[PDB]
Amino acid sequence: STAVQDSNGESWNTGLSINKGESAYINANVRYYNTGTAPMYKVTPTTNLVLDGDTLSTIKAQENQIGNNLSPGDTYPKKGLSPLALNTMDQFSSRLIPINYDQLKKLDAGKQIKLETTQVSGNFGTKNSSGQIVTEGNSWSDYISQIDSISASI
């Protein structure tokens, strides 16, 4: 006997891999405001990101998210501009903000992430031995505790 078989097929594969430790990255569009009597220079807030009772992250603003000037009644970015993106977690703006698999399942169930500002850093302006304004080294945190201890808030 002698047989000759000739074949040809074709295949199709689709895959999907998922990390359960970092299943998504979150990006918060935020905006600062000043309702006091003095301006703040080099505004650096610290914010909580809360899903249910779990604080996902607290992030101090980096160079990308610092507001240079913020006068009383103003807003950074100014009125008419778009909010700024807070999408990195580390000191050099090189790492994104991750969430779990369960937190991602909570996010598409309709649950909302809440932002809470826990503190703000910033400088004030003085005059040096010349007529020049200097703001470096003039931290407001040196006076927050003292002002809040002898005052009444209205």
Partner 1 sequence: NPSTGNTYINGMYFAPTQTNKEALDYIQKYRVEATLQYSGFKDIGTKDKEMRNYLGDPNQPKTNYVNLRSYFTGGENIMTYKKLRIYAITPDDRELLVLSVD
Partner 2 sequence: EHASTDQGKTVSRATTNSKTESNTAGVSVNVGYQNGFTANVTTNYSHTTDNSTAVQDSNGESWNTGLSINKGESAYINANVRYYNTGTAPMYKVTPTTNLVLDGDTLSTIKAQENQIGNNLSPGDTYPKKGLSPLALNTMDQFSSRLIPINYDQ
**Residue ranges that bind a copy of itself, judged by CB under 8 A:** 39, 41-42, 67-69, 71, 76-78, 81-82, 84, 116, 118-119, 121, 125-126, 132-139, 141-146, 148-149
Looking up tokens 């505004």, which residue turns up?
43
Question: How far is 16 from 83, CA to CA, in rounded Å?
Answer: 34
What are the phi and psi torsion angles at 101 (to 5°)?
-80, -40
By a kind-dependent CB cut-off of 5 to 8 A, residue 68 interacts, out of partner 1, partner 2, a copy of itself, none, with a copy of itself
Nearer to partner 1, 3 or 16 (CB): 16
Q: Is 109 in the site for partner 1 (CB under 8 A)?
A: yes
The 3-state secondary structure of 30-52 reads: ECEECCCCCCEEEEEEEEEEECC
Q: Buried b / exposed e across 46-59, counting CB within 10 Å, b at 16+?
A: ebebbbeeeebeeb
Question: Which sign does the torsion angle of CA 99, 86, 142, 149 carry?
Answer: negative
End-to-end CA distance of the chain: 104
By a kind-dependent CB cut-off of 5 to 8 A, residue 109 interacts, out of partner 1, partner 2, a copy of itself, none, with partner 1
By a kind-dependent CB cut-off of 5 to 8 A, residue 108 interacts, out of a copy of itself, partner 2, partner 1, none, with partner 1
Residue from 11, 129, 130, 151 in contact with partner 2 (CB under 8 A): 11
Residues near partner 2 (CB under 8 A) = 1-21, 46, 48, 50, 53-60, 89-92, 94-95, 116, 118-119, 121, 141-142, 144-145, 148-149
